[PDB]
């Protein structure tokens, strides 16, 4: 399990910041929509877990709001990479929230990671794949702990 280094965190925070639309939700929705389309293609059963947010219509306001929440949650975590004490509390918070959702399992996080790995090079310039992979693992593993 390769470590998400200080250098990796710098790379990831740079890629993430450079691609961010700070005043409008449309870009983060598009990013997340692509991630979910990939996730659901890879694991058709996973879509049922999202019935509470209208996953059956990914263009719905309900699902688009979920997309905003997910990208927000990841944005907050990424921005905490240089303060891991705080990161740990955030990931523990997210973990509790996912524990509360019946059927969400650690294996799903591996599929989610594949989905981000596919989508990020399509939205980020000079995207650093190795640093992303290691630091996404750092974050995802924290959320998936206990499930």
């Amino acid at each position: 399990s390769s470590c998400c280094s200080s250098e990796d965190r710098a790379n990831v925070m740079h890629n993430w910041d450079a691609a961010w639309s700070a005043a409008y939700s449309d870009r983060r929705v598009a990013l997340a929509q692509a991630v979910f389309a990939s996730l659901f293609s890879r694991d058709a059963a996973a879509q049922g877990l999202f019935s509470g947010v209208s996953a059956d219509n990914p263009d719905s306001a309900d699902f688009r709001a979920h997309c905003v929440r997910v990208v927000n949650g990841l944005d907050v975590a990424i921005n905490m990479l240089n303060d891991p004490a705080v990161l740990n509390e955030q990931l523990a918070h997210l973990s509790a929230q996912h524990q509360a959702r019946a059927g969400v399992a650690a294996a799903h996080f591996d599929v989610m990671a594949e989905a981000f790995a596919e989508v990020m090079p399509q939205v980020s310039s000079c995207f650093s794949s190795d640093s992303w992979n290691r630091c996404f693992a750092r974050i995802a593993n924290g959320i998936s702990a206990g499930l």
């Binding site: 639309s21 700070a22 005043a23």
Partner: protein, 145 residues
């Protein structure tokens, strides 16, 4: 002068503050529709004379708004090169001469709507420099109208 090099730099800087890295590319429509709303009120010009009849739900009018904000952008950004700016304005003048019912007064009203909306989204705006430079723009677009 009226719209001096210094005035022009202030106006360009303030337009850039409105359309900065966060806002550029995402806010033009909202800024543009607001400019048109103020213009219609001050000028009494019929929305029906515009593509899509001035209806903000119509793609034809939204495309018109995109063109107008872009035209304003191009003129504003050229304010420090007066010879180039004069040429841009002469081109716009020709385009409006080809359109029935464009008046000099109405061109003035639209230019002042740009300034007023800018001051609404940017409270610190130098309203004098905007007045002088938008008047120079209006004079060029509205020539002979």
């Amino acid at each position: 002068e009226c719209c001096s090099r210094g005035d022009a730099e202030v106006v360009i800087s303030e337009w850039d503050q409105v359309f900065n890295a966060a806002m550029a590319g995402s806010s033009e429509s909202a800024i543009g529709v607001a400019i048109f709303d103020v213009f219609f009120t001050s000028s009494g010009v019929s929305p029906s004379m515009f593509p899509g009849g001035g209806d903000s739900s119509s793609a034809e009018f939204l495309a018109q708004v995109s063109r107008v904000i872009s035209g304003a952008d191009i003129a504003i950004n050229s304010l420090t090169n007066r010879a180039t700016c004069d040429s841009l304005l002469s081109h716009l003048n020709a385009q409006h001469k080809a359109i029935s019912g464009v008046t000099g007064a109405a061109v003035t009203h639209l230019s002042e709507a740009i300034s007023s909306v800018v001051a609404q989204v940017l409270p610190s705006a130098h309203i004098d420099a905007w007045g002088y430079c938008m008047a120079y723009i209006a004079a060029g677009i509205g020539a002979g109208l």
